[PDB]
Amino acid sequence: FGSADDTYPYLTGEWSTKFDYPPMPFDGFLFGSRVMIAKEVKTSPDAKKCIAACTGVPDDKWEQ
Amino acid sequence: GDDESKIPAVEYFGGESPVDSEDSAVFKATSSTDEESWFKALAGSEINWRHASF
Amino acid sequence: STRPLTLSHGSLEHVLLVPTASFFIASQLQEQFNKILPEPTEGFAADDEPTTPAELVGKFLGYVSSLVEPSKVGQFDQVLNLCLTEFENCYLEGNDIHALAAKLLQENDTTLVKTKELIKNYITARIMAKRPFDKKSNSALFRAVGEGNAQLVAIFGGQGNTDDYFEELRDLYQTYHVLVGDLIKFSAE
Amino acid sequence: VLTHRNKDGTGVRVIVAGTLDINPDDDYGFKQEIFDVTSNGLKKNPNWLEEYHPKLIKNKSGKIFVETKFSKLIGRPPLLVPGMTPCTVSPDFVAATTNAGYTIELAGGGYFSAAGMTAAIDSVVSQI
Amino acid sequence: ASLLLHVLVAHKLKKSLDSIPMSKTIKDLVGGKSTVQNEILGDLGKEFGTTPEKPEETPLEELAETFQDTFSGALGKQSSSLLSRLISSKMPGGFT
């Protein structure tokens, strides 16, 4: 996750309707990779510049 | 419905385990009185400093 | 002016309060009943035998129900009537036979064919000593639909569910002989 | 039973009136529940949408929380920065994230000794 | 647990102690009966207590070691009641 916009369905439970299942809400969220380019993380300047360079990929393909 | 006013107000939000109106009352403690049942009555219905304290 | 009779088998028994007016009838049933069932063995796991006092009264009720005429008011009709009223007051506590049959399976060491025979025997006894179900039963579920809490939908299955559908119909006719005997007869004709 | 699986978590109880048995899980009912007189004929299944509905709530100060089972306990909004071996090592980040008012895990990962982690945790405390 | 598991399955299927191979799932060696299927799973819930997830999709050989960890010696509810029947219903007529 990176923002509100992608994580809101899982809060609602409306996401499980996409897989023909009844609504299925969650209680909380943890945010990993997203946090790594903060003002006050110890990750190096040139390192952060490499992280933002990474374009990324949606969920259908990540096993490439 | 885009209205802040309809949101329930509570003094402090927190310290709520996820498993679960009288003005002048008197409570008598015995040998048998339950610990949990005792603090429920003392804290009172309204979430406040008294609810926190107990 | 009552008289005690002890329907007994092994280590469990029920004391039956028999009126002295008809005891010569009931005492001869006691001897004839206490010989067809086999020898007691700890756990009482044998399906011919009862595991609980409730089952023992059920086994008696079933035996008396086989010796009654539906039309001809015989000698055994006032014997069966005061075996029900004892069984209904001691072990049913104003519940249905099924809610009792539930408890026996999960509390005691009873099995499916052990509890199915009890339901047959009781309901047979209710009709043979004529006391039909005319009371609007105190159903928890159906009180809750009258109040407006619960809503009910009945669904009906189809072909594919079992290898043998007929065994359910046999188990139905065996247990519910006195209830569906008119319905089965009508469909067959 | 098949129907029960298709809408488990919609607050729908299935009662099999054909056969008398007992469900250990108590997912679905048998013949009894119909005929029962006690509070064991009226058993409601959970509705996941209605039980675990995300809410809003305000302070006396008037700050808004996403009210969920998790947020209820911690008295903070239910977003945590998890344990990350390079990222969550420094006390300086753990503290400032908690100073933002959001829960975070210190990672033992980048620490080698009872001695070393103690001085790290003490550095967190001094700043929060 | 490997012997006790085999006996509980063999007794319910009305089949011999060698006609059941251990390297076979519970839904396999039942005739898709399902009521026979969950009746076996109902027995294993009573016998051992805690079951894995979809136990009727992992072979009895594989499923034996999972119980073997948390199980030790003591028969329990279901097996004792079946041995209670075996001597009582059959013909050790005098000796219990």
UniProtKB/Swiss-Prot annotation, chain C:
Subunit structure as annotated in this protein's UniProt entry: [Alpha(6)beta(6)] hexamers of two multifunctional subunits (alpha and beta).
Family designation: Belongs to the fungal fatty acid synthetase subunit beta family.
Main function: Fatty acid synthetase catalyzes the formation of long-chain fatty acids from acetyl-CoA, malonyl-CoA and NADPH. The beta subunit contains domains for: [acyl-carrier-protein] acetyltransferase and malonyltransferase, S-acyl fatty acid synthase thioesterase, enoyl-[acyl-carrier-protein] reductase, and 3-hydroxypalmitoyl-[acyl-carrier-protein] dehydratase.
Miscellaneous: Present with 91800 molecules/cell in log phase SD medium.
Name the UniProt record assigns to this protein: Fatty acid synthase subunit beta
Natural source organism: Saccharomyces cerevisiae (strain ATCC 204508 / S288c) (Baker's yeast)
Taxonomy of the source species: Eukaryota, Fungi, Dikarya, Ascomycota, Saccharomycotina
From Swiss-Prot, chain E:
Entry comment on modification after translation: 4'-phosphopantetheine is transferred from CoA to a specific serine of the Acyl carrier domain by the C-terminal PPT domain. This modification is essential for activity because fatty acids are bound in thioester linkage to the sulfhydryl of the prosthetic group.
Carrier domain boundaries: 1-74
O-(pantetheine 4'-phosphoryl)serine PTM sites in chain numbering: 34
Similarity field: Belongs to the thiolase-like superfamily. Fungal fatty acid synthetase subunit alpha family.
Additional notes on this entry: Present with 17000 molecules/cell in log phase SD medium.
Record's subunit section: [Alpha(6)beta(6)] hexamers of two multifunctional subunits (alpha and beta).
Function text: Fatty acid synthetase catalyzes the formation of long-chain fatty acids from acetyl-CoA, malonyl-CoA and NADPH. The alpha subunit contains domains for: acyl carrier protein, 3-oxoacyl-[acyl-carrier-protein] reductase, and 3-oxoacyl-[acyl-carrier-protein] synthase. This subunit coordinates the binding of the six beta subunits to the enzyme complex.
Protein known as: Fatty acid synthase subunit alpha
Species for this entry: Saccharomyces cerevisiae (strain ATCC 204508 / S288c)
First-to-last residue of the parent protein present: 147 to 242 of 1887
